[PDB]
Structure formats: structure tokens, C-alpha cells
Amino acid sequence: ANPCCSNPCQNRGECMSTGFDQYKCDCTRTGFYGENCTTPEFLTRIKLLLKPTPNTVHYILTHFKGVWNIVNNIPFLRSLIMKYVLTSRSYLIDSPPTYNVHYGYKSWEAFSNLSYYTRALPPVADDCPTPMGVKGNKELPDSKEVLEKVLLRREFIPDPQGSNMMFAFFAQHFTHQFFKTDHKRGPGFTRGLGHGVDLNHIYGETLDRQHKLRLFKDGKLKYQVIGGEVYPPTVKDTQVEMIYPPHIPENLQFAVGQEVFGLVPGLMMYATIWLREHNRVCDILKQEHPEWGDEQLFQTSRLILIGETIKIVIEDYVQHLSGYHFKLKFDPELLFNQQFQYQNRIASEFNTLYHWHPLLPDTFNIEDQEYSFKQFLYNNSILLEHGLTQFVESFTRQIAGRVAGGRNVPIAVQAVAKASIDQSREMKYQSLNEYRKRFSLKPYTSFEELTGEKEMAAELKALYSDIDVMELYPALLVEKPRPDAIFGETMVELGAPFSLKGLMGNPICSPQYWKPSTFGGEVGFKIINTASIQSLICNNVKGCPFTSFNVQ
Amino acid sequence: ANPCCSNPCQNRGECMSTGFDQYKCDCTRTGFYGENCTTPEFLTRIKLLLKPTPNTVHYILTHFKGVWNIVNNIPFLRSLIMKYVLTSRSYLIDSPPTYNVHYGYKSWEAFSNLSYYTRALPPVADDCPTPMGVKGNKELPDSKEVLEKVLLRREFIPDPQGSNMMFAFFAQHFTHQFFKTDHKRGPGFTRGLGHGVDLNHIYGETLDRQHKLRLFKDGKLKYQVIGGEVYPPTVKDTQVEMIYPPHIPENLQFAVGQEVFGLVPGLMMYATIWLREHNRVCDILKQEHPEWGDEQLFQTSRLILIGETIKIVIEDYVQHLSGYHFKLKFDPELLFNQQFQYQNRIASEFNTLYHWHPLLPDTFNIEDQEYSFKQFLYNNSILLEHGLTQFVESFTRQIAGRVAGGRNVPIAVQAVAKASIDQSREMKYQSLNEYRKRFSLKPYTSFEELTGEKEMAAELKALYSDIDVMELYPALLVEKPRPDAIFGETMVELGAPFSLKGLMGNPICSPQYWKPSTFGGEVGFKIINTASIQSLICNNVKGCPFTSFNVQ
Ligand code: HEM
Ligand code: HEM
Ligand SMILES: *[C@@H]1O[C@H](CO)[C@@H](O[C@@H]2O[C@H](CO)[C@@H](O[C@@H]3O[C@H](CO)[C@@H](O)[C@H](O)[C@H]3NC(C)=O)[C@H](O)[C@H]2NC(C)=O)[C@H](O)[C@H]1NC(C)=O
Ligand SMILES: *[C@@H]1O[C@H](CO)[C@@H](O[C@@H]2O[C@H](CO)[C@@H](O[C@@H]3O[C@H](CO)[C@@H](O)[C@H](O)[C@H]3NC(C)=O)[C@H](O)[C@H]2NC(C)=O)[C@H](O)[C@H]1NC(C)=O
Ligand SMILES: Cc1ccc(-c2cc(C(F)(F)F)nn2-c2ccc(S(N)(=O)=O)cc2)cc1
Ligand SMILES: Cc1ccc(-c2cc(C(F)(F)F)nn2-c2ccc(S(N)(=O)=O)cc2)cc1
Ligand SMILES: CCCCCCCCO[C@@H]1O[C@H](CO)[C@@H](O)[C@H](O)[C@H]1O
Ligand SMILES: *[C@@H]1O[C@H](CO)[C@@H](O)[C@H](O)[C@H]1NC(C)=O
Ligand SMILES: *[C@@H]1O[C@H](CO)[C@@H](O)[C@H](O)[C@H]1NC(C)=O
Ligand SMILES: *[C@@H]1O[C@H](CO)[C@@H](O)[C@H](O)[C@H]1NC(C)=O
Ligand SMILES: *[C@@H]1O[C@H](CO)[C@@H](O)[C@H](O)[C@H]1NC(C)=O
């Protein structure tokens, strides 16, 4: 019935119903006019001709290694380039946020209710004749069919970028501070009211939990020593609620910021590394500030670890993902004479696109052992058995799986992949191509253009019939990868903007925050500005083991 | 104890303790350097010489009536001027917010905890030797003494700007959506988690309350008809919690967004006017959108009333307060090519400075009657007795009191003035002069310079001894007023920045919001862009009585 069910309005024009059968597009500031915001304004046509495609730009970022080598060493050029990578993307994210699972038009409820993931594209109205709007059949294809036919791994396909398990677990650990779906309410709701990098996964969402996690001397987090090694405290000692299956002995129930982290030893590894890091920074701060009390030492340390986390993500993590020869930089100052909103809201689609389960291997290989999924999950002995050092050495060596290119979701975790499909539909996601369009990408004209091959395309075609009805999530995992890259174009172009907004939108990047005293002086500031995945592990793991995000 | 107690750092440098007895100032981006951020940089000296004082600028805004008359009629000049008034102030507010009652240094707790009023200046550390830091005596003067000596009204001093009761009650009504101190926690905490103009005082803080207040047809708010006139529903019909003394009969317990509004008939007057307005905009929207359901009609109407509210406040309310000959304009577009944070956090100091109780008259005069405080409070009969029309006519005629200039707090309300003093101290406010310095104002060098007279100055001197120990709140009510103005310099210069930030920071002012479809089309948009205090009363109060914020 809804006359906007067709997504009539293009180039970001907003569709509004003007009577039961008519509609109108608001093209304000889109750069286009006409009934459907498809006729470009003169100034808009220039831009549309002087605008390289993302695939061109990526090509330039991943070639001319010699030229980038020179740029990387001219601080003022490096700054000019990073500033461009930061700002070019800004315009792709609504901020303040707009829509959510229940609101396809702006409302105060949508803006003000922090429990919702926000939405880059509004849901398909409940009374549209098809799931994707007006196109396709009354129902989407059997999710199980799509799962089995183009998603499930036959043979393990390694990531050509050499991503490793140190990377896979870092992504899970880091992303799981802001992806915390509140399943009691539904898939489109969140328990991460911080809506960003606040390290609630170390310190807790709520003051109540934070306080159980704290030692209240020297600003430190409680911890225990086992075989001379530092580890998170126990549930028994802290009373913080954790999710453990009943058969887990009280002494193995580790308490950390995030209630789910006890479930995977990879998580607990990072949880332990970051716990050590926080207490480490405390000793540094106390040294500088014998006048300081427990609160200030604690809060300052937290501010510093937020900085470290943003640094490592941009300069090591995204760096490695990108494959860029240009050396990415974490420098808030680059946005200071620029228009930018220091605020963020986690988008449902960001969450969805970030279900990188293909990363996971068939077995988890530590030292001599090869642990099956069954053996690895909820088994922290494995951690105590080998220790952090051996975990880091091992995970640095084991290659992670390719995410795009299709057929690489481990069977052990198929239920999670099916849910990703089913819950997308539940949330009334628009189609792959609508999302491509929304991110300034050219719609795919056939399934074969999407996959870059024939077999999976043919299966997808038989299932969906029309490319314009293809779904975002599966498309992501099935897409033709960039050359020797871990992802396809859609993943990158949707992901980068959400990612940089959540990184740079954090308040410590704001002018009033981004200064030495915020972090307890120049020595605190330097911890942030010199932080790296290597130092993090080096400072906190015994024998300062070498690590990196790819199998060297 | 704390080295930072004396407030050593100037020009917005941050004080940090470097050892028990030393300190350091972070002057990053202040424009000054040196141990105390007092030595200006070359570029800073130019600015400091080409910068007119606020008292000069005010003079220019309130004279040359002929010139402003021309500027007000050249749309592009009017736009250039308002843009300057908007932006000149921006730099005075920390956004993202920084400090609060418990945090004198930035922390994630301070930033993230939405229950706190933020702070424009950090509290005085708990272990400073004096209340103001290092200056003054171990305790401030008897708050009662200050109350009685320079705050209590002998004779009613009328506002020379001719502010009236329609104005007084509008400020109470409007401000009381974002000033809602949570007294269970303490004076530095708020129940207004919207931290701005969200009209929760009409619609409720929580979804639960909103829903009890709503009719669920045509997007309307419940209401009742009494003697052919429309009024808010009752507590018995709705179950919404209100604050009424026990002797109030169930049929007089009106339910509205803000639990406290039943306490003053002036509040209930506006509460009724805005309730009517909301249902009025619903009829308009249904007419335009017969396709629309109850939710969308309700939410859109709310978006529109937010807009109307921001419009009226800038173009009528602040207009009248300012005394400016320049015609202020509500135009979000003026900030679109500008650096600005669409976000806000209510400052404790804003709350404090807005305790405009001197506005209140000795009696409330409606038609023939002269009601005492005792008779007026919690008495909604008075409203049903005379009706809205007669209330508007009467309150348009009755002059309000002058706020600055001293000795004008009605005795009936002395307890509230004392609390304002006591709770300031409880929250560890810095001194008047610290706050002056913080808003780029020149410290007062004597009490006589503050009051502009001798008698109240002498009393204040005998009480405080040192001008540099004088307190913000009393100073506000006692200050020498601008010429024939309602306020003194300190009130204006502190007040204006907080005020404009809360008005313009609202998301509907953000580019992705400020467009017709957000408000259900050009007809909804036009309601916002033509709204005025007069159109509000006229479309909603029988007889379309003439109203205004000032006495005729
Ligand atoms: C290591 C073994 C893993 C298992 C057994 C697993 C399984 C699951 C399960 C059951 C969920 C939904 C429940 C939850 O919140 O935890 C989930 C969600 C998710 N997974 Fe994983 N996963 C694993 C690793 C990873 C990795 C490496 C990533 C890469 C970032 C990842 C990304 C995500 C994301 C972003 C969600 C959504 C979380 C939420 O909405 O709360 N997972 N996975
Ligand atoms: C109409 C008769 C009025 C009465 C009986 C009254 C009384 C009070 C009382 C008892 C309080 C503190 C009570 C509490 O917060 O629990 C208060 C606070 C306050 N008053 Fe008034 N007042 C009146 C009018 C006004 C007006 C015209 C203004 C002008 C703006 C005003 C400004 C304020 C403000 C800003 C607060 C702070 C409340 C908060 O922090 O949440 N009042 N008033
Ligand atoms: C963010 O949006 C959420 C979804 O709208 C809100 O969650 C919903 O709030 C309601 C309570 O405020 C619940 O509705 C039910 O309403 C009936 C009416 O009479 C009550 O009796 C019920 O007790 C109440 N709940 C139950 C158990 O039936 C919704 O169930 C509730 N949850 C969901 C997922 O819809 C959030 O409240 C909102 N957040 C904020 C801060 O307002
Ligand atoms: C914003 O900051 C507020 C002020 O710190 C927080 O409010 C405080 O949270 C505490 C709950 O975590 C309460 O403290 C008490 O702690 C002991 C622990 O052993 C409990 O037994 C007590 O029952 C608990 N309070 C009670 C009911 O006695 C504080 O009372 C509470 N309020 C104040 C004024 O401090 C807010 O929690 C915080 N907001 C967020 C979102 O974290
Ligand atoms: C979820 C997500 C997706 C992308 C990014 C990201 C950000 C950036 C940058 F440079 F803008 F910072 N690049 N970049 C990126 C670029 C290219 C690839 S690739 N090698 O798969 O084509 C992979 C990642 C980050 C997070
Ligand atoms: C609480 C508060 C305080 C000041 C203002 C304000 C804002 C503005 C402006 F500039 F933005 F338009 N002026 N302006 C203002 C200016 C001058 C006076 S006056 N007649 O007392 O000197 C009174 C008010 C608003 C709210
Ligand atoms: C209204 C005309 C008199 C005002 C000036 C009074 C100076 C302060 O006088 C005070 O008056 C208070 C209010 O009645 C009383 O509660 C106190 O006992 C008294 O000290
Ligand atoms: C917009 O395209 C044209 C108007 O130029 C119109 O025929 C069409 O109906 C509109 N879009 C859709 C989906 O039909
Ligand atoms: C957990 O790991 C331990 C130690 O390596 C192993 O012996 C045990 O079998 C594992 N338990 C499960 C249920 O996999
Ligand atoms: C800052 O002012 C000067 C340093 O230039 C010095 O006299 C003074 O003591 C410093 N701080 C204080 C406490 O005034
Ligand atoms: C309330 O007002 C009514 C009529 O306006 C008046 O007669 C009555 O005395 C007042 N009641 C109180 C409680 O003062």
C-alpha cells in the first residue's frame, strides 16, 4: 500500500507519502532535483565526472609502493592524505543518527532512544507487498538453502592478506564492546549504550559492575596470580555476572568487563592482555603522580587505554586490513579545522557486515595441539595450560579465513550464519543494491558481477531470480574480493565510514580532550601516541613475544 | 593541599598536579603560554586589541535603531549578523562536555553519565583550605545574612524592559523541561536525560509516561472538556504520576508531561496551550496525510512543536530579553557551512543562573482578583474559574520584576533563594570572578563595581571582605544592570552561550533533519517557520486575545 515501498527516491532523497497512492521526494541538499531526485544540478555533474570509482582509488592506495614510501616520510603530506581519508567518508553517515528498526521516518523516539542500533537505511515498511519492497517474491529464499549453497565451507580458504588469529580475535574482542545485541528485546537493540569505543568490555557498562571489577587502590583492576602469571579475577571473588555453562568450575570463571568473553579463550587472551595493560598504566601514572588517589588513577588510565585502542585499531588493525601502502595515522588534530560531529551511534548494518565468521579456522592450533570448536569453547584451561606467551606465538602463526569470495563459513558455526540471514530479514533490511546505492556504489547488474564467477552466481540466481532482490549479508560473504584482498567492494565501502566515525567520533578526539593533561601529562599522552599491537603484547606478555596481524 | 586549589592557570589552561606541592598548566590551544598561560602569543595580542568589550557590543545592538531597521530588511545582512551572534559564542562551551560536581578532571564517567549536570568550571577540590580555593575565610558568610541583606524584596522593583507574567511563566515552563534536579541524588544531578529542548514536559521523560498521556488516535494527547474548554486529562483517567498536595480533588489533578506543573496555574496555563497546539498540529497533519497512522502523526507533531518552541524562544523570548534592535532569526542553515556540535549537555551553572525568582510579583492579578502566593499555588480552580483567555489577557498586562539590581526576591519564596546559595556551595562552585574570567569577562575589582551603588556593596564587603571571594549566584541578582535592562553583564555573558547551544544543538537543526519531510511536508515546515508567541495563543486560546512578552 505504502507508495514509498518501491524506494522511489534516489541519491538520498527522502520519500514521503502524500495521500494513499502518491508520494513525494525531498531532495534538499542532495545535489539533484526532479520527481525522484535523479536529475543532477550543474555543479553536481562536474563532481560526478571528476570522481574516481572506489575501485580506482583502492588501486592507487595499493600500488606505486615507491611513491607511498616517499609520502609516508613527508609528515605534512602524510597528514594531508590521512585528512582526506578521514573527511571523504564523513558525508556517508547521518550524524546525529536518524532511523532505526521501528522508524522509517525521523522521530524523537528514534533519535533519543539509546537502546536501538541506528539504521543507515530505513526499514521496508511493514505493509509493503514484498520483503524487499515491491520486487521479488512474497518471501525470500529458504535461508538454509542460501546458507548451504553459497555460504558453508567445503575446503578452508585462507585469507590472501595473511590475516592471522591474533587479528581474528582482536576483531571479535574489540568489536564486542559495541556489538552487544539485547536479544530479550530483539536483534535491532543494543546493550552497548556507549555506542562506541568506551572499553566497557574491560571496565563494564555500569558503575555497579565497574566497581566490582576494581581494586580501589592505585586505580587498578582486581586480578589473580596463577602459576606466577596475572589473570582476571574470578566470579566468586568479584560477584560480577558472567556467562558460563554450569559445568565450569568456580576457579575458571573469570570475571571481565564483557559477560560473554569467558566463552572463547581468544577473547580471554585479549581480556587478560588489556587488564594487565590497565594496571601497567596505573603504575606509570602513580610514578608521575604520587599525589593522585585511586579514582583519578583509574579514570585517567581508562582514558589512556581508550586512546591506545583507537591508535592500534587505526595504525595496525585497519592498516593491515586495508592493504594500503599509505601509512594510516591516528591524529585527532587533522579534524580540528574541519566540520565533524564528535558523536556516534552504532548502526545495525555495521553490526551485520562485521559478522566475520569465515575468519575462523577448522581447528585452533596452539603449540602442539589442534583443538576442535567443541574443545575450544568455554575452555579456559587451554589458556592456563599454554599461557599467554604461547597463545600469542601460536595465534601469530595460524592463518585466518577469507571473508568474501564465498563458501567459507565454518560448519561449526552455521547456526550463527543462518541467524545473520534470518535476523536481517526480521529487521526488514533493504536489498544489497539499495545499500550499494546508499553508499555511492553502482548497483550490481547480475549475480555474476557480484561473485565474479559462475557457479555460486547460478545458484544465487536460481534462488533469488533478480539481482535487485539479493540480500546484503550473504552478498557480503559471497562478493568478488578485491585483488588478493580479504573483502569485496561492498564490505569496504559500507564498513570504512562506520568504522572511522566510531573511532574519530569518540570524545577524547575532541579539541577540549585531545591534550596532555587529559591523560595525566606528556608521559600519559605518549603511551597513546606510541601504542601499537606489538608494544601492547610486548609490555604485557612474558618474553615479549613477537606478534603482528598477519602470518609474516 | 591540592596545588591546583588557587586556580593558578589562566585563559582556560588546565591545572594538573605534578607532585604534592607542584602543578603544571596545559595551555594547548589557549592562545597563551608560560607557567600560568598568561603570556599571549603574537596572533593572540592582535585579537585582544581588535576585540570590543561585551558592554560595547551590547551598546551597538541596542542603539542606532535606524540602521538596524535597514539591516533587518536586507535578508542577506540579517543572515550574516545572526550567523555571527550564533558562532561568536560557540567557543565558550565545552562540547563534548567535560566536568561535573564529582570530577575536576576529565574522566569517562564524567563524559558518559547522563544523570549529571555538566560543569562550565570544575568544582573546587574537596581538600582545598577554603571554599573558594585558597582565598577567603574557612567558611563563606551566613547564607541567611546574604539573603536578607541584599536579596529580599522591600519594595517591588519592576523590570524596566516591561517583561510581563506571560514572559515569567513561559521561562519557568520552558526551562523546566531541562532543569529537573534529582534531589534524591543531589543538586548536581538531573532527571532531564534529554539534556535539552525535547518537550518532555509535555510528552514525558519515559515512553511509559508518554503512553499514558496519549490518546492513540490521530497522534493526539488525551484531554478533557470542561465548560466547553479543552484541558489536560486527569490523574484518575491516565495514572500518570503528578505532584499534588493531598487535599487536591481528583478532578483537579491534571496530568501533563512534567510532574510538577500542577503546582502553579501559570505552568498549567502553558501546559494547556501546548497540549492544544499538539492536537491542533495533528489535525493539520491528518488533513495532509490521511494515509498516516497514529504513531507517525504523533511523532511528527512532536518534531514540529520542538521546532515551534525553538522558533518562539529565539525570535520572541530571547528577542525581548535582549532589547536588541536587530531582529534575531531562527535559521539552522546559518550553521551549515560552519563548525558546530549538534549535541548538548545542561550545565549546573546555567541552571543556577536561571533562578529568576525576582521576576515574580507580590500578587498574581487575574481579572478583578489579586491572589497571594498562598492562594495561587496548587490552585487550578483559579484557572478553570477565569479560563485561558482571561489568564492570557491578565498576564499580558501584569509587569514582572527586575532580576538584577538587587533586593527583589519575593519573601514568599526566600527558602528557594537560600537554597540557591547553599546548594551552590554544596556543589563547590568557584567564585564569581573565576566564572567571569571563564567567560572572557574582566574580574570585578570591588563590590561597588559589581553593584554600581554603595549600600549593598558595603553590606557585601562587610560579609565577604574580598571581591575575589564573592559568589556567583548572589552576584547575579545583585549586579549592576545594563542600562534599563533586566540583567547585568555576568548573567547575559554566561547565559547567552548555554542558551544558544541548547537551542541550536538540538538535532532537528542538523542538516539531515532540517528539511520539509522531517516535518511531514512544506505545510508542517511552515508551522515551525511562522510560529510566534502570538500565533501560538491565537490558534489555541478562544478569542485570539492579544499577547506579548511585555507590558503595553
Ligand atoms: C571465536 C569463535 C566464535 C563463535 C563461537 C561465534 C559465535 C557467535 C554467536 C553465538 C553470536 C551471537 C551471540 C553473541 O553475542 O556472542 C555471534 C555474533 C557475532 N559475531 Fe561471532 N563467533 C565467534 C567469533 C567471531 C569473530 C572472529 C568475529 C569477528 C569480528 C565475530 C563477529 C561477530 C559479531 C560482530 C556478532 C554480533 C554480536 C552481537 O550482536 O552481540 N565473531 N558469534
Ligand atoms: C511561579 C511560582 C514559582 C514558585 C512557587 C517557584 C518555586 C520554586 C521551588 C520551590 C524551587 C525548588 C524546588 C525543587 O526544585 O524541588 C524552584 C526552582 C527553580 N525555579 Fe522557581 N518558582 C516559581 C517561578 C519561577 C520562575 C518564573 C522562574 C523563571 C525561570 C523560576 C526558575 C527556577 C529554576 C530554573 C529552578 C530550578 C529547578 C531545578 O533545578 O530543577 N521559578 N522554584
Ligand atoms: C526504547 O524503545 C523500546 C521499544 O519501544 C522501549 O521498550 C518498551 O517499553 C515498554 C515499557 O516502557 C514495554 O511495553 C509494555 O507496555 C504495557 C502497556 O500497559 C505495559 O503494561 C508492559 O508492562 C510493558 N512491557 C511489557 C513487559 O509488556 C515494551 O515491552 C518495552 N520493550 C520493548 C522491546 O518493546 C524502551 O522502553 C525505550 N527506551 C527508553 C529509554 O524509553
Ligand atoms: C551516575 O553517577 C551516579 C553517582 O555516582 C551513579 O549513582 C550511584 O550508583 C550506585 C549504584 O552503582 C549507588 O551506590 C550504592 O552502592 C552500594 C554498593 O554496595 C549499594 O549496596 C547501594 O545500595 C547503592 N545505592 C543505594 C541504593 O544505597 C548510588 O547510591 C548511586 N547514586 C548516587 C547519587 O550515587 C549512577 O549509577 C551513575 N549512572 C550510571 C548510568 O552509571
Ligand atoms: C569494517 C571495515 C571495513 C573497512 C575498513 C577500512 C577502513 C579504511 C581506511 F583506510 F579508510 F581507514 N580502509 N579500510 C579497508 C580498505 C580496504 C580493505 S580491502 N583490503 O579488503 O580492500 C579493507 C579495509 C575498516 C573497517
Ligand atoms: C539566560 C539567558 C541570558 C542571555 C540570553 C541572551 C541571548 C542573546 C542572543 F545574543 F543570543 F541573542 N542575547 N541574550 C541577552 C542579551 C542581552 C540581555 S540584556 N537586555 O539583559 O542585556 C538579555 C539577554 C539568553 C538567555
Ligand atoms: C517585605 C518588606 C520587608 C523586607 C525586608 C526584610 C529584611 C529581612 O528580614 C527578614 O524577613 C524575613 C521574611 O519576613 C523573616 O523571615 C526574617 O525573620 C527577617 O530577618
Ligand atoms: C521515478 O521515475 C519516474 C519519474 O521520472 C517514474 O515513472 C517512476 O514511477 C518513479 N520511480 C518508480 C520506482 O516508478
Ligand atoms: C579443555 O582443555 C583441556 C586442557 O587442554 C583438555 O584436556 C580438555 O579435554 C578440554 N575440555 C573440553 C570439554 O574440550
Ligand atoms: C603564576 O604566576 C607567577 C608565575 O609566572 C607566580 O608568581 C605565581 O605564584 C604563579 N601561580 C600562582 C599561585 O599565582
Ligand atoms: C483557589 O481559588 C479559588 C477560586 O479561584 C478560591 O476561591 C479559593 O479560595 C482558592 N483556594 C485555596 C486553596 O487557596
PDB file of C-alpha atoms in Angstrom, chain A residues 214-317:
ATOM      1  CA  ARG A 214      38.109  -2.665  40.653  1.00  0.00           C
ATOM      2  CA  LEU A 215      40.723  -2.965  43.404  1.00  0.00           C
ATOM      3  CA  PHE A 216      40.257   0.566  44.705  1.00  0.00           C
ATOM      4  CA  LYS A 217      43.969   1.078  45.271  1.00  0.00           C
ATOM      5  CA  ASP A 218      46.206   2.722  42.708  1.00  0.00           C
ATOM      6  CA  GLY A 219      43.302   2.774  40.212  1.00  0.00           C
ATOM      7  CA  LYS A 220      43.806  -0.885  39.422  1.00  0.00           C
ATOM      8  CA  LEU A 221      41.519  -3.663  38.321  1.00  0.00           C
ATOM      9  CA  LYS A 222      41.302  -6.716  40.563  1.00  0.00           C
ATOM     10  CA  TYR A 223      43.333  -9.667  39.324  1.00  0.00           C
ATOM     11  CA  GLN A 224      44.658 -13.056  40.455  1.00  0.00           C
ATOM     12  CA  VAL A 225      48.079 -14.754  40.109  1.00  0.00           C
ATOM     13  CA  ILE A 226      48.191 -18.301  38.789  1.00  0.00           C
ATOM     14  CA  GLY A 227      51.496 -20.002  38.281  1.00  0.00           C
ATOM     15  CA  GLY A 228      53.218 -16.620  38.599  1.00  0.00           C
ATOM     16  CA  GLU A 229      51.054 -15.185  35.825  1.00  0.00           C
ATOM     17  CA  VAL A 230      48.493 -12.373  36.075  1.00  0.00           C
ATOM     18  CA  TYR A 231      44.895 -13.141  35.134  1.00  0.00           C
ATOM     19  CA  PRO A 232      41.416 -11.685  35.612  1.00  0.00           C
ATOM     20  CA  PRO A 233      39.740 -12.304  38.992  1.00  0.00           C
ATOM     21  CA  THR A 234      37.042 -14.901  39.485  1.00  0.00           C
ATOM     22  CA  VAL A 235      33.276 -14.629  39.597  1.00  0.00           C
ATOM     23  CA  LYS A 236      33.443 -15.931  43.191  1.00  0.00           C
ATOM     24  CA  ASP A 237      35.821 -13.143  44.248  1.00  0.00           C
ATOM     25  CA  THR A 238      34.012 -10.324  42.393  1.00  0.00           C
ATOM     26  CA  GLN A 239      30.323 -11.254  42.040  1.00  0.00           C
ATOM     27  CA  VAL A 240      30.285  -9.868  38.533  1.00  0.00           C
ATOM     28  CA  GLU A 241      27.875 -11.859  36.377  1.00  0.00           C
ATOM     29  CA  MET A 242      29.499 -13.817  33.564  1.00  0.00           C
ATOM     30  CA  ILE A 243      28.062 -16.308  31.076  1.00  0.00           C
ATOM     31  CA  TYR A 244      29.486 -19.756  31.774  1.00  0.00           C
ATOM     32  CA  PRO A 245      27.955 -23.148  31.209  1.00  0.00           C
ATOM     33  CA  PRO A 246      27.145 -24.794  34.610  1.00  0.00           C
ATOM     34  CA  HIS A 247      29.936 -27.351  34.397  1.00  0.00           C
ATOM     35  CA  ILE A 248      32.673 -24.680  34.566  1.00  0.00           C
ATOM     36  CA  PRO A 249      34.462 -24.806  37.951  1.00  0.00           C
ATOM     37  CA  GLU A 250      34.359 -21.677  40.102  1.00  0.00           C
ATOM     38  CA  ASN A 251      38.105 -21.136  39.729  1.00  0.00           C
ATOM     39  CA  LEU A 252      37.904 -20.969  35.929  1.00  0.00           C
ATOM     40  CA  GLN A 253      35.038 -18.496  35.870  1.00  0.00           C
ATOM     41  CA  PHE A 254      36.970 -15.387  35.004  1.00  0.00           C
ATOM     42  CA  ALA A 255      35.285 -12.026  35.532  1.00  0.00           C
ATOM     43  CA  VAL A 256      35.839  -9.337  32.914  1.00  0.00           C
ATOM     44  CA  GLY A 257      34.129  -6.294  31.527  1.00  0.00           C
ATOM     45  CA  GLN A 258      32.122  -8.236  28.961  1.00  0.00           C
ATOM     46  CA  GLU A 259      29.942 -11.053  30.231  1.00  0.00           C
ATOM     47  CA  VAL A 260      30.470 -13.205  27.182  1.00  0.00           C
ATOM     48  CA  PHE A 261      34.236 -13.172  26.991  1.00  0.00           C
ATOM     49  CA  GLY A 262      34.664 -16.324  29.076  1.00  0.00           C
ATOM     50  CA  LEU A 263      33.184 -18.223  26.187  1.00  0.00           C
ATOM     51  CA  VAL A 264      36.242 -18.132  23.903  1.00  0.00           C
ATOM     52  CA  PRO A 265      39.890 -18.436  25.069  1.00  0.00           C
ATOM     53  CA  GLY A 266      40.833 -15.986  22.305  1.00  0.00           C
ATOM     54  CA  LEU A 267      38.692 -13.391  23.981  1.00  0.00           C
ATOM     55  CA  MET A 268      40.022 -14.179  27.426  1.00  0.00           C
ATOM     56  CA  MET A 269      43.527 -13.818  25.989  1.00  0.00           C
ATOM     57  CA  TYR A 270      42.902 -10.208  24.971  1.00  0.00           C
ATOM     58  CA  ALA A 271      40.835  -9.585  28.079  1.00  0.00           C
ATOM     59  CA  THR A 272      43.889 -10.577  30.115  1.00  0.00           C
ATOM     60  CA  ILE A 273      46.322  -8.548  27.978  1.00  0.00           C
ATOM     61  CA  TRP A 274      44.212  -5.385  28.372  1.00  0.00           C
ATOM     62  CA  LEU A 275      43.668  -5.954  32.089  1.00  0.00           C
ATOM     63  CA  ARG A 276      47.472  -6.129  32.502  1.00  0.00           C
ATOM     64  CA  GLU A 277      47.864  -3.021  30.341  1.00  0.00           C
ATOM     65  CA  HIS A 278      45.482  -1.003  32.505  1.00  0.00           C
ATOM     66  CA  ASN A 279      47.313  -1.865  35.742  1.00  0.00           C
ATOM     67  CA  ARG A 280      50.569  -1.232  33.977  1.00  0.00           C
ATOM     68  CA  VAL A 281      49.455   2.284  33.031  1.00  0.00           C
ATOM     69  CA  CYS A 282      48.394   2.771  36.666  1.00  0.00           C
ATOM     70  CA  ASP A 283      51.918   2.137  37.905  1.00  0.00           C
ATOM     71  CA  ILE A 284      53.165   4.613  35.351  1.00  0.00           C
ATOM     72  CA  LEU A 285      50.653   7.238  36.416  1.00  0.00           C
ATOM     73  CA  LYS A 286      51.312   6.715  40.135  1.00  0.00           C
ATOM     74  CA  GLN A 287      55.004   7.173  39.478  1.00  0.00           C
ATOM     75  CA  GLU A 288      54.213  10.510  37.810  1.00  0.00           C
ATOM     76  CA  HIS A 289      51.512  11.356  40.330  1.00  0.00           C
ATOM     77  CA  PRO A 290      52.172  10.246  43.867  1.00  0.00           C
ATOM     78  CA  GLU A 291      49.545  12.911  44.832  1.00  0.00           C
ATOM     79  CA  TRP A 292      46.806  11.138  42.979  1.00  0.00           C
ATOM     80  CA  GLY A 293      44.081   8.995  44.516  1.00  0.00           C
ATOM     81  CA  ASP A 294      42.633   5.715  43.337  1.00  0.00           C
ATOM     82  CA  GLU A 295      39.750   7.292  41.345  1.00  0.00           C
ATOM     83  CA  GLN A 296      41.870   9.633  39.299  1.00  0.00           C
ATOM     84  CA  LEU A 297      44.480   6.994  38.584  1.00  0.00           C
ATOM     85  CA  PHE A 298      41.742   4.647  37.423  1.00  0.00           C
ATOM     86  CA  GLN A 299      39.848   7.117  35.226  1.00  0.00           C
ATOM     87  CA  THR A 300      42.985   8.542  33.684  1.00  0.00           C
ATOM     88  CA  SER A 301      44.229   5.042  32.893  1.00  0.00           C
ATOM     89  CA  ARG A 302      40.924   4.299  31.231  1.00  0.00           C
ATOM     90  CA  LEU A 303      41.189   7.446  29.115  1.00  0.00           C
ATOM     91  CA  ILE A 304      44.678   6.302  28.039  1.00  0.00           C
ATOM     92  CA  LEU A 305      43.584   2.746  27.112  1.00  0.00           C
ATOM     93  CA  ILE A 306      40.769   4.230  25.016  1.00  0.00           C
ATOM     94  CA  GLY A 307      43.481   6.221  23.206  1.00  0.00           C
ATOM     95  CA  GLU A 308      45.730   3.211  22.818  1.00  0.00           C
ATOM     96  CA  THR A 309      42.797   1.210  21.453  1.00  0.00           C
ATOM     97  CA  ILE A 310      41.957   3.852  18.838  1.00  0.00           C
ATOM     98  CA  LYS A 311      45.625   4.121  17.870  1.00  0.00           C
ATOM     99  CA  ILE A 312      46.151   0.383  17.449  1.00  0.00           C
ATOM    100  CA  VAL A 313      42.945  -0.023  15.524  1.00  0.00           C
ATOM    101  CA  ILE A 314      43.771   2.672  13.015  1.00  0.00           C
ATOM    102  CA  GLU A 315      47.520   2.182  12.624  1.00  0.00           C
ATOM    103  CA  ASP A 316      47.828  -1.608  12.937  1.00  0.00           C
ATOM    104  CA  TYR A 317      44.404  -3.197  12.523  1.00  0.00           C
TER     105      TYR A 317
END
